[PDB]
Amino acid sequence: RVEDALHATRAAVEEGVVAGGGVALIRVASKLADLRGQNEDQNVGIKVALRAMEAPLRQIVLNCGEEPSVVANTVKGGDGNYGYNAATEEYGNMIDMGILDPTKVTRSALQYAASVAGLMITTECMVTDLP
Amino acid sequence: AAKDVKFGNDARVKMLRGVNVLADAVKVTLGPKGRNVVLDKSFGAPTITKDGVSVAREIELEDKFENMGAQMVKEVASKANDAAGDGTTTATVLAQAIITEGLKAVAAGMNPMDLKRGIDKAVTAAVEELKALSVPCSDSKAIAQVGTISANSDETVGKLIAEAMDKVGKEGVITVEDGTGLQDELDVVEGMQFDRGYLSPYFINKPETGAVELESPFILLADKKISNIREMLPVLEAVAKAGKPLLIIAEDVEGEALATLVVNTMRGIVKVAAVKAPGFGDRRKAMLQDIATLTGGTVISEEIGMELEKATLEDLGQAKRVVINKDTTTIIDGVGEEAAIQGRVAQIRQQIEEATSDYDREKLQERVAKLAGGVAVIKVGAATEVEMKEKKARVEDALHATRAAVEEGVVAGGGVALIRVASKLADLRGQNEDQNVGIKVALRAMEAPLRQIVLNCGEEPSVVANTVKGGDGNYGYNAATEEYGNMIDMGILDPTKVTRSALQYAASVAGLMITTECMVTDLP
Amino acid sequence: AAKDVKFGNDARVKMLRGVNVLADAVKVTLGPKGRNVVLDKSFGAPTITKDGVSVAREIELEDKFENMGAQMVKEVASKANDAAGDGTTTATVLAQAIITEGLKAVAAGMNPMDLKRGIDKAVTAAVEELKALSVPCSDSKAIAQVGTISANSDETVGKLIAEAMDKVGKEGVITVEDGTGLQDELDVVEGMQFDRGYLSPYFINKPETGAVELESPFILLADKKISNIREMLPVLEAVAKAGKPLLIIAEDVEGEALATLVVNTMRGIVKVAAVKAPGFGDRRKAMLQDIATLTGGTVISEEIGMELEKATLEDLGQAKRVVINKDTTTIIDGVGEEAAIQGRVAQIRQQIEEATSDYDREKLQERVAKLAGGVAVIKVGAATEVEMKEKKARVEDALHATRAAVEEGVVAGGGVALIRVASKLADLRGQNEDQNVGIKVALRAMEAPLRQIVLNCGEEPSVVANTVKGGDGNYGYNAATEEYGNMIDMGILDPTKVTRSALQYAASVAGLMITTECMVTDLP
Amino acid sequence: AAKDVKFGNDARVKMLRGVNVLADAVKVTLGPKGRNVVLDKSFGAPTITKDGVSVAREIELEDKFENMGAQMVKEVASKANDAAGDGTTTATVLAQAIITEGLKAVAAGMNPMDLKRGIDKAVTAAVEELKALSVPCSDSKAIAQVGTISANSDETVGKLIAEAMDKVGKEGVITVEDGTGLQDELDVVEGMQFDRGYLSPYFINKPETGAVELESPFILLADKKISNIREMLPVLEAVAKAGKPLLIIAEDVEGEALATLVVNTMRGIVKVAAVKAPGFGDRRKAMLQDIATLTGGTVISEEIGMELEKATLEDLGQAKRVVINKDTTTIIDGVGEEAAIQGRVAQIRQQIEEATSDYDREKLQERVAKLAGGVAVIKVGAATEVEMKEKKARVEDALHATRAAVEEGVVAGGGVALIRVASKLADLRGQNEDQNVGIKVALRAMEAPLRQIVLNCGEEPSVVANTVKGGDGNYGYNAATEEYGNMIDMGILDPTKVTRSALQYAASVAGLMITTECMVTDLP
Numbered sequence A: 001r002v003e004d005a006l007h008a009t010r011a012a013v014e015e016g017v018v019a020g021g022g023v024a025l026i027r028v029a030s031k032l033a034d035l036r037g038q039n040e041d042q043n044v045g046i047k048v049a050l051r052a053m054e055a056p057l058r059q060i061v062l063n064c065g066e067e068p069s070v071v072a073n074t075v076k077g078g079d080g081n082y083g084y085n086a087a088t089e090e091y092g093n094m095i096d097m098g099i100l101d102p103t104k105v106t107r108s109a110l111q112y113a114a115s116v117a118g119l120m121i122t123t124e125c126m127v128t129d130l131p
Numbered sequence B, C, D: 001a002a003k004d005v006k007f008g009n010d011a012r013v014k015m016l017r018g019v020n021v022l023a024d025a026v027k028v029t030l031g032p033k034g035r036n037v038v039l040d041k042s043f044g045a046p047t048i049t050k051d052g053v054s055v056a057r058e059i060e061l062e063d064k065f066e067n068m069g070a071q072m073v074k075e076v077a078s079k080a081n082d083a084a085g086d087g088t089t090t091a092t093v094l095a096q097a098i099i100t101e102g103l104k105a106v107a108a109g110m111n112p113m114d115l116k117r118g119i120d121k122a123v124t125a126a127v128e129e130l131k132a133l134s135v136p137c138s139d140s141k142a143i144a145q146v147g148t149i150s151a152n153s154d155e156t157v158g159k160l161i162a163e164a165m166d167k168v169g170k171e172g173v174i175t176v177e178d179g180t181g182l183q184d185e186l187d188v189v190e191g192m193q194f195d196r197g198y199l200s201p202y203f204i205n206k207p208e209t210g211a212v213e214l215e216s217p218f219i220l221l222a223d224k225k226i227s228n229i230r231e232m233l234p235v236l237e238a239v240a241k242a243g244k245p246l247l248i249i250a251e252d253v254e255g256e257a258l259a260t261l262v263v264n265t266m267r268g269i270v271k272v273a274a275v276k277a278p279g280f281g282d283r284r285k286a287m288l289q290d291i292a293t294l295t296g297g298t299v300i301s302e303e304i305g306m307e308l309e310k311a312t313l314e315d316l317g318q319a320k321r322v323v324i325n326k327d328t329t330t331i332i333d334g335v336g337e338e339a340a341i342q343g344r345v346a347q348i349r350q351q352i353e354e355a356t357s358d359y360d361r362e363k364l365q366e367r368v369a370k371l372a373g374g375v376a377v378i379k380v381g382a383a384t385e386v387e388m389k390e391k392k393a394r395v396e397d398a399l400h401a402t403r404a405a406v407e408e409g410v411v412a413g414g415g416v417a418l419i420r421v422a423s424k425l426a427d428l429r430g431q432n433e434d435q436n437v438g439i440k441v442a443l444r445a446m447e448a449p450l451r452q453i454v455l456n457c458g459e460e461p462s463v464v465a466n467t468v469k470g471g472d473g474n475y476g477y478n479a480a481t482e483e484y485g486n487m488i489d490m491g492i493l494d495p496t497k498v499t500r501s502a503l504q505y506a507a508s509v510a511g512l513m514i515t516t517e518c519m520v521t522d523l524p
């Protein structure tokens, strides 16, 4: 519990800490709603990514037994570092409640997940060994 | 016949599977954001409809046990239709939600008999809470508002109903028929309506209405049980002679005489319709002669020396159009002498004076009010023929909604009435833990109608239902405009009667189905 | 390796099915009215036993998912055995009852995480209530009563234990070995016991005990990690020369050196046994030299210039019998100079004087008390050889029960202790409805042990459990005599420790199993 | 290994089916009107035999569960053989009859634990009743009668036994070996017999006897556990040098050293045989030196400075033929100085004088009586070689029957002893109804041995058993002559010991099998 704590603190210095509970991404989602591409197909590509940013929060709520749709809708209505605490089933300021994620980890989690999805969406042919 | 028998958990899962087919086929047609259901016919083109009744009627499954389940909840939909005419889909979505959640508890290991009592207590309390939430329609100005929004924002429809109810009263009899020309007509003619229905469902020649209709029909009256058709033959012989329809009002019609008229009418030989006599016992014999002088016939009771064999056109009662529902018969505009009509009216208004008992007073008053009061007729005026059709089809429904708006009132629509009741009964408890869950099953079932409308609208039902519960009163969701607000102000409203019927009936069947342990059906 | 993955309800039913096999195979052997379970062996005759541990160990299912379930609750039975030595069957009957009723709630649609917390809170409260119901064994007269009834009404057994505990104390170390002749002997010899176990389970040469045993074993001591066997070779070369067993006490034994000794011992070449050093850090280096002068060896830490290659019999510690459990090692009667034993004892009794901290005082006191205090030895006296066997087998168990009778005490047997706790926690509630059921699951699980004993006795469990609940206190059912009465007065009692272990462990696994959603295993 | 588990009724029917195969294969060989059972061998001709043991040994079923059943009752047959040598078929016919009728009651819905106790009480009473029916053989004239009829009316056999028992006594040791010439010889030579058996069954080089035999064998004596073969090697090196067999008497022989001698002996390299030391504890160390001076070896206990590596032929004990049964070892005619034999005898006859305790007196008396008393040898005299065979094979059995005739006596044969006990225990009752049936099961099982003999004789068993029950005393049925009469007068008799063993053992297994609820075996 020192090894992990050092790893989190390391990332807390390099890039900082954002609001946890997957609210950081869902907060970014509402702030990029005006973002557009070059054609209609690119425009959907953005909306795919923005609706993907809601999923981490939605998944935590699903494990908590509560309806993810209701909770995500409430978090989006309020602004800032206002989120859902799944441990206590209480809403409030995430930073004040000690729920936080190092910015570095959330940046890595998003970038990498997009990198592979990008490669997989552009896949047309697959070659493997015969059963 | 060899039978198949299933027990317990094995037997129940076949019902649930069965009801889920009928429910899912009907629940898709809920609300104004509803979907179309296509029903196949052997002859030509398929029928595309949103009518939850038409869809329900068609469902019949292969697996005999599944079929039973489906056919059980179907019996409710049709009965909700019999009570109000509206809310058949709303009944079915409720029934499913009580059954699905109910059976879950039974399978968890809870007492079905305690679960039923939990539901019924929650319902009796919900009907009681619903009456408090109801906004009555008293004056003829608020009555016009209900007839307008029910006929798709048509002010001409609501104006006619208000004028019709101002003539015969709120208890009075109102009927709609085809128009003569270009303007809507309204007359009050000498007629009567009583509480009996068709003695067989094979007389329904207006399948859309689900009722019987006879133009200028000759009417028969006799106090006795018609079993042999021998006595009917000379009457039927003279009816196809000068071909006009025939109404049979008797103590009853049994076996041989009855089962002949059915294959008789469908083949095309003679238009017939059979109904039990009005009332029972003493009033039976008087309400017949009440019909008689309303129609201009004769009572042929087998007493003085009168038979059905020597009964001609001369001995029969004539009226210029009759309608017979499942449990409603009405004779519009009969013959008879008007002075001998008031001469029969004053023959019974004289009884009330000598009425030494207060019960006679009750049942002598019901006669005259519908006998000298009469029956109203709304003749629907349109220019083109296709416009004459739709204006009739949107007055009939509008009258049915207005009828219920007077009797019990109107609650907030959008399925919010039930979801408002749900939050107000959260403190309700039973006698044991098993009863307590039975209540919570019923309360979570009341959320389903709203949730289903939102599902059809494409929006997430969980989000919308959660928002409606947070706000209070007649605040709900408009699925047509995708806007929140006051339902009453937006014209979205349901007659209290239809929502009460939809809930009660759906609970009644679910209660019976939850307490099911054994099923017996024919072998495949 | 290709894997098979099952989710949710599908995944859980495979566990339940799996645990139900292991449980039903073990629950039949509960109580004194228990049934025999026959276990097949490839070589010769089958084993007929009532021992719930032996039956549990053998269960391993074909369906990989079912196997997992079974193997999960098996991990508890064995761990209950590790904590007390008793109540392995009682653990398993509990675990089943929590799982079966738990999963029922999950399938009904309740939060597993709330169900777990409900169970654990009910358990933490039950352990707390159990301590209050416990009747302590303080004086050596009531200690004799427990050792008597545990060894089948034998007064000679209980007398020996009481005399042994009067010599070394309640915290003192007591060991049983084979007798010399016709009378029971009791000496206190210079020995020590510490909290480490066998570094591999393949040294168990007494399968019934589930432990290791070495007669006149040579002992090795070195502070470092033994990974290569190169350094061990010259030591092992001189041990088969004058063939006597060998005890390896080191910081640890890793990989190559360890995995060789296992195929070494089972083949028959050299009797070995490997154990981690006593304690960690600072006391590690001192408790080694505490063993050293207890045994008469030397600490060969790689500091001054000492290696394991130049380490003969001369540099090794000798003792006249050692035992090694899973988590218990004990060196009985070592060599060393007695004056240099007290010379090492007074080298550490001198530390307590200079002990500027109160923690040193704690961990300098534990050394000497088990070092100059010693280890007791009960030499079992019998006439015939077959009588020498059973008297040993009924002292070992009797000592284990008496040990637990001192540490936590004894509650009322017959599974009434738990059923008494059940009625006293009926007012216990959680935070939400789902937690509330979690408690009621645990309380109805506490009834099962009693109910299972009654089932084996042939009587209806429902009737007997209902009668025990009506009466209060230590009033229960005697399955042997089919009589009701005071359990304590009838000699039917369970050490509090075993019942606490049986409940806690069974809840711990059920808690983990209820919160299971996904299972991953190898493909068939 | 994946396992298959069956429960309850399903599990039991597989046992019954299993035992019925073994029983029906053995019960056909009962009595003198018995049938032949043919046993196949891979090498050459099949074996035709009537020996119930040889048939039992061969049975092993395909269905793993059935096999278990069969293998369970097989364990009894072999154990009855170990107790008496006779009545293995009579045991098996009893066991079946208790199991078949027992399981019938269990399936009817009766408590197995009450059924077992009912049987065992009926048995304990039957053994008690059997002792009363027994006619003892005291004088050496009635002892001659038993040895005569057991060896097929041969008077020469019975004369030798009586003369042998007149030399060493009734407790004395009597052995038979091959003759030198034409007359039967009888000498009393210095020897001893003790209560230990072969440490492995793979030394049996006389398969018909089921025992080990070594001609002029060298004997080893050491008090310690032989685990490594390193210490044995120099001893074994000098034995194949001047090739003579070897007897290993030690505290024990463990693992590596033991499992080598087995693949050693069967290959053909060195004739070995391993046995535990005589007695345990103190007498262990003295009875070794009791063997020593009986044999002329030395005790090589690891005390003074003596090892097994420096132990030559010179340090070993010599005797001129040893036999080792499963639980019987006997050293016939050893070396040693006769004056130092009486010098060791008077070294222990001196102990009894100083014996301050009465227990020493008991266990110092057993030594000398079999040490200075000796062992008898009957050298079988015949003319031809084939006649030398059979005369040996009919003295060995005749000695075994006579042995049991002295210890407990002889009851009436023809299975009438048990059927006589059956009628005398008809008033015996248990504690509840279920126990009462348990007794009646055992009593109807006692009829089966007789009934089976009659079945082989071709006559109806029901008729004969009914006739035997009507008459009283030692009146029974002679199956050989098809005549009724006094069994004792007709020479038909069974040693009480064999009938007691046959009943007790058959009940012991049936008791365990009736209380079976779960079976665990390997997957097919």
Ligand SMILES: Nc1ncnc2c1ncn2[C@@H]1O[C@H](COP(=O)(O)OP(=O)(O)OP(O)(O)=S)[C@@H](O)[C@H]1O
Pocket: A019, A020, A021, A022, A060, A084, A085, A086, A087, A088, A099, A100, A101
């Ligand atoms: N009380 C809480 N309420 C809501 N979210 C929480 C709470 N506590 C932690 N979290 C969120 O939990 C998320 C992390 O989930 P984890 O289970 O740690 O999975 P992970 O970090 O992706 O991978 P692992 O399993 O740690 S290697 C973080 O983004 C936190 O924001």
Ligand SMILES: Nc1ncnc2c1ncn2[C@@H]1O[C@H](COP(=O)(O)OP(=O)(O)OP(O)(O)=S)[C@@H](O)[C@H]1O
Pocket: B029, B030, B031, B032, B034, B050, B051, B052, B053, B085, B086, B087, B088, B089, B090, B091, B412, B413, B414, B415, B453, B477, B478, B479, B480, B481, B492, B493, B494
């Ligand atoms: N704009 C609206 N927004 C939300 N709900 C509406 C709206 N308009 C009507 N409703 C609801 O629609 C529900 C009725 O659905 P319908 O489709 O009429 O089904 P039904 O009445 O159960 O049976 P049928 O099909 O009429 S026979 C009523 O309860 C209204 O509250």
Ligand SMILES: Nc1ncnc2c1ncn2[C@@H]1O[C@H](COP(=O)(O)OP(=O)(O)OP(O)(O)=S)[C@@H](O)[C@H]1O
Pocket: C029, C030, C031, C032, C034, C050, C051, C052, C053, C085, C086, C087, C088, C089, C090, C091, C412, C413, C414, C415, C453, C477, C478, C479, C480, C481, C492, C493, C494
């Ligand atoms: N005469 C009796 N009547 C009722 N219960 C009894 C009686 N004697 C013992 N018991 C109960 O028997 C229970 C123990 O059953 P056991 O067969 O010992 O199973 P276990 O202790 O869980 O595991 P094993 O098999 O000993 S390793 C104890 O809780 C006693 O309360």
Ligand SMILES: Nc1ncnc2c1ncn2[C@@H]1O[C@H](COP(=O)(O)OP(=O)(O)OP(O)(O)=S)[C@@H](O)[C@H]1O
Pocket: D029, D030, D031, D032, D034, D050, D051, D052, D053, D085, D086, D087, D088, D089, D090, D091, D412, D413, D414, D415, D453, D477, D478, D479, D480, D481, D492, D493, D494
């Ligand atoms: N002439 C006879 N008539 C009736 N019974 C007889 C007669 N001769 C012997 N017996 C009975 O035969 C029974 C013994 O049967 P055996 O064939 O010897 O089987 P067993 O003794 O059980 O086992 P084996 O085969 O000897 S190892 C004895 O109990 C005798 O009572």
Ligand SMILES: [Mg+2]
Pocket: B086, B087
């Ligand atoms: Mg509608």
Ligand SMILES: [Mg+2]
Pocket: C086, C087
């Ligand atoms: Mg126990």
Ligand SMILES: [Mg+2]
Pocket: D086, D087
């Ligand atoms: Mg025999």
Ligand SMILES: [Tl+]
Pocket: A064, A065, A066, C111, C114
């Ligand atoms: Tl929750």
Ligand SMILES: [Tl+]
Pocket: B029, B030, B031, B034, B050, B051, B052, B089
């Ligand atoms: Tl609809």
Ligand SMILES: [Tl+]
Pocket: B216, B217, B218, B244, B317, B318, B319
């Ligand atoms: Tl007419």
Ligand SMILES: [Tl+]
Pocket: B457, B458, B459, B482
């Ligand atoms: Tl929409």
Ligand SMILES: [Tl+]
Pocket: C029, C030, C031, C034, C050, C051, C052, C089
């Ligand atoms: Tl047990």
Ligand SMILES: [Tl+]
Pocket: C216, C217, C218, C244, C317, C318, C319
């Ligand atoms: Tl040693």
Ligand SMILES: [Tl+]
Pocket: C457, C458, C459, C482, D111, D114
């Ligand atoms: Tl019983």
Ligand SMILES: [Tl+]
Pocket: D029, D030, D031, D034, D050, D051, D052, D089
């Ligand atoms: Tl035989």
Ligand SMILES: [Tl+]
Pocket: D216, D217, D218, D244, D317, D318, D319
């Ligand atoms: Tl020899």
